[PDB]
């Protein structure tokens, strides 16, 4: 998994998997756009990385 505050930190760049939070709190296209609160990463398409 990409390490927080690292050269691949999902929080700083984006989710590794499309529309899937890093901590697994969301896996649905509906919830697109809300950052998580357990790992703190926006939920979008992976393209943003």
């Amino acid at each position: 998994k990409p390490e927080r505050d690292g050269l691949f930190c999902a929080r700083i760049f984006g989710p590794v998997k499309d529309y899937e939070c890093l901590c697994g709190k969301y896996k649905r296209l509906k919830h697109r756009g809300v950052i998580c609160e357990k790992c703190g990463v926006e939920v979008t398409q992976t393209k943003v990385r």
């Binding site: 990409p2 050269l7 691949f8 760049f13 990385r49």
Partner: protein, 49 residues
């Protein structure tokens, strides 16, 4: 961005560490070290070097 400097793995835990990642590791390491010295009473010649 993390995409354009990817860290592609191999059949095992062998990752193609692209030079960009390594240079970034080096420079960020120097930066962290130098900051930690700056707060820690900063011996002048040492912070200079």
């Amino acid at each position: 961005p993390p995409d354009l400097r990817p860290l592609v793995p191999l059949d095992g835990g062998r990752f193609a560490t692209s030079d960009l990642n390594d240079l970034y590791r080096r420079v960020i390491n120097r930066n962290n070290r130098l900051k930690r010295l700056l707060d820690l009473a900063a011996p002048d010649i040492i912070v200079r070097n």
